[PDB]
Design an enzyme around this catalytic site. Structure first.
Site, PDB file in Angstrom:
ATOM      1  N   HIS B  41       0.806  -1.223   0.000  1.00 34.46           N
ATOM      2  CA  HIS B  41       0.000   0.000   0.000  1.00 34.46           C
ATOM      3  C   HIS B  41       0.839   1.272   0.000  1.00 34.46           C
ATOM      4  O   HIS B  41       0.257   2.340  -0.116  1.00 34.46           O
ATOM      5  CB  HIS B  41      -1.101   0.042   1.083  1.00 34.46           C
ATOM      6  N   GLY B 143       2.031   5.500   9.697  1.00 36.15           N
ATOM      7  CA  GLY B 143       3.464   5.583   9.447  1.00 36.15           C
ATOM      8  C   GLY B 143       4.207   4.364   9.994  1.00 36.15           C
ATOM      9  O   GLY B 143       5.350   4.117   9.608  1.00 36.15           O
ATOM     10  N   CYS B 145       3.335   1.274   9.437  1.00 32.41           N
ATOM     11  CA  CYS B 145       3.246   0.202   8.450  1.00 32.41           C
ATOM     12  C   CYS B 145       4.616  -0.199   7.950  1.00 32.41           C
ATOM     13  O   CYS B 145       5.495   0.651   7.783  1.00 32.41           O
ATOM     14  CB  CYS B 145       2.320   0.600   7.313  1.00 32.41           C
TER      15      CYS B 145
HETATM   16  C1  LIG Z   1      -3.950   4.562  10.402  1.00 35.23           C
HETATM   17  C2  LIG Z   1      -3.089   3.383  10.777  1.00 35.23           C
HETATM   18  C3  LIG Z   1      -2.715   3.181  12.101  1.00 35.23           C
HETATM   19  C4  LIG Z   1      -2.021   2.038  12.448  1.00 35.23           C
HETATM   20  N1  LIG Z   1      -1.661   1.097  11.571  1.00 35.23           N
HETATM   21  C5  LIG Z   1      -1.982   1.296  10.288  1.00 35.23           C
HETATM   22  C6  LIG Z   1      -2.691   2.407   9.830  1.00 35.23           C
HETATM   23  N2  LIG Z   1      -3.072   2.539   8.466  1.00 35.23           N
HETATM   24  C7  LIG Z   1      -4.130   1.893   7.937  1.00 35.23           C
HETATM   25  O1  LIG Z   1      -4.713   0.984   8.507  1.00 35.23           O
HETATM   26  C8  LIG Z   1      -4.650   2.462   6.620  1.00 35.23           C
HETATM   27  C9  LIG Z   1      -5.894   3.282   6.966  1.00 35.23           C
HETATM   28  C10 LIG Z   1      -4.951   1.318   5.615  1.00 35.23           C
HETATM   29  C11 LIG Z   1      -3.735   0.435   5.300  1.00 35.23           C
HETATM   30  C12 LIG Z   1      -4.092  -0.707   4.345  1.00 35.23           C
HETATM   31  C13 LIG Z   1      -4.698  -0.182   3.050  1.00 35.23           C
HETATM   32  C14 LIG Z   1      -5.916   0.677   3.341  1.00 35.23           C
HETATM   33  C15 LIG Z   1      -5.579   1.818   4.304  1.00 35.23           C
END
Ligand SMILES: Cc1ccncc1NC(=O)[C@H](C)C1CCCCC1
Ligand SMILES: Cc1ccncc1NC(=O)[C@H](C)C1CCCCC1
Lengths: 304, 304
Positions: B41, B143, B145
């Site tokens: 992503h 961030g 991820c």
């Molecule tokens: C915000 C946050 C906080 C902690 N961990 C991760 C994230 N980010 C997300 O889960 C995105 C919203 C998601 C990611 C996958 C594709 C769609 C969008």
């Protein structure tokens, strides 16, 4: 979101761990620049431990009696000295992995990460608080002596603790990096009174703020209190009295959440008086006091 | 003695963290040998996130669009490919800090350490369990991820998790290092059902053994039970049914303490039926399930 008992990344500290042997005893040492720091009790044997005469025991030792090994390599010891309860072994090689570091003496109620080690090798890392009574509730077996506690501010490691002893109650005692014990403790195998401990009130409030930030809000109520009224409750429940300095440190959390510190104090008062009623806050069924307000801010903002 | 929620030393993993940027998105990458692994992503923008067509989005990207930085240095990308939900960026330089490593897919109920990172920089380390429903209850902000989960066996790091997503319930989802999600999850901003979760029974029993080893024994009783009777209770309380394989794994702990596994099951049954009565076990006011029997043995023996 989510809130965890997070330790600092231990890499910078792993690079400083060495094994120190003197006679029959092996423990951990901290190699920074050209000095290795370790608990002075590495020079004792089983007979010595009730009341060692450290000055006399050290006089029977020479530089060549201190075997220092950093995994694959042996360090050459060119000096030794005792400072309070630590030995400082001067070696001929500066640790190439020495990070930017400071030696700090932490205050009770502050938190730090411990890198538990055995034979100079790291086994694990955990976060803990220095209790108001100057003990720590760690996880240390025989051989873990010399393992250190620390905090990291960007690229600087502030070493605050070196492990020395397990009290007969199973709680832990140690020194700052100048070898001064935290608390009344002495490095001898005797039963030693740890003072009456208390719960770190400012940390519990900080953790209640982390709970609200992360969605756990069931404990918020329609009440408020005063420092005086709250401190009568803190008294009854063996919590540290809250001061304006503690309220001031909670300022950023109060501002971010919009919940006045005395309003959070009234939530804490109700939780102390009524318990959790079988509910949880951030996965805990008790009031957690091992997160400082700085820890909550750092964790909730993603500081590296 | 003492028992803590200990994470593995994170040093070997810190040396692999990099920052990956593609367009407007920055997240973390894992640099092992000459490949950088990151969540796919990273190629999405805000408009794409409801249902990204990853194959199409990746076709608009070239090697030079993936900016990989390992702190002070920029890595040259000479290839890119998507494998399941991860991107693999081939770089022209092998990571000099690549530890001995394996990629493993863990089973639900197993534990691991997470090194939470932001912009390729480590912020902290914590231990957690892969829930029976394939989610993890972590601490991750936007961030984070690309942050990874791992275990260490002597000098070998087994990477088991890469963080991808926070579900609308605040729980976390991610993949193995081949980009396969744990659980039913898909990398798109949609509400997604996490299954009914359960408590990891074999881990709670392992932690009851760690409690006895460390002096907390108030919960031991004069009773015993059978797997059948215990599983009726496990059923009522949403605990995983215990099997002979789980009893077999608890063997070393049962042998060391002399408490038969079914006798510990009868202690657990009573705690489930009566609660803790305002008492604690190893500093916890609830039944902890984030320690496997292997974790208890490792911690109680001082393995490095
Ligand atoms: C915000 C946050 C906080 C902690 N961990 C991760 C994230 N980010 C997300 O889960 C995105 C919203 C998601 C990611 C996958 C594709 C769609 C969008
Ligand atoms: C056993 C153990 C476990 C965890 N942590 C430490 C230790 N070791 C000790 O506290 C010694 C008994 C003590 C050390 C100080 C001098 C007297 C002897």
């Amino acid at each position: 979101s989510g809130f965890r008992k997070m330790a600092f990344p231990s890499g910078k500290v792993e690079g400083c761990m060495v094994q120190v042997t003197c006679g029959t005893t092996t423990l951990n040492g901290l190699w920074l620049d050209d000095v290795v720091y370790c608990p002075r009790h590495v020079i004792c044997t089983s007979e010595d431990m009730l009341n060692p005469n450290y000055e006399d025991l050290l006089i029977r030792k020479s530089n060549h009696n201190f075997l220092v090994q950093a995994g694959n390599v042996q360090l050459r010891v060119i000096g030794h000295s005792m400072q309070n309860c630590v030995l400082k072994l001067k070696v001929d090689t500066a640790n190439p992995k020495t990070p930017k570091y400071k030696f700090v003496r932490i205050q009770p109620g502050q938190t730090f990460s411990v890198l538990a080690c055995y034979n100079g090798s790291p086994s694990g890392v955990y976060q803990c608080a220095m209790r108001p009574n100057f003990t720590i509730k760690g996880s240390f077996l025989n051989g873990s002596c010399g393992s250190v506690g620390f905090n990291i501010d960007y690229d600087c490691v502030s070493f605050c603790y070196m492990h020395h002893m397990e009290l007969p109650t199973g709680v832990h005692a140690g020194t700052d990096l100048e070898g001064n014990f935290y608390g009344p403790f002495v490095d001898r195998q005797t039963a030693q009174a740890a003072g009456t401990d208390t719960t770190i009130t400012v940390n519990v409030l900080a953790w209640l703020y982390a709970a609200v930030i992360n969605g756990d809000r069931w404990f918020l109520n329609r009440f408020t209190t005063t420092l005086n009224d709250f401190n009568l409750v803190a008294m009854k429940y063996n919590y540290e009295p809250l001061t304006q300095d503690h309220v001031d440190i909670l300022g950023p959390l109060s501002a971010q959440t919009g919940i006045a510190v005395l309003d959070m104090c009234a939530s804490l008062k109700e939780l102390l008086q009524n318990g959790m009623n079988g509910r949880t806050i951030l996965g805990s069924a008790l009031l957690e006091d091992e997160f400082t307000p700085f820890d909550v801010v750092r964790q909730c903002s993603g500081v590296t």
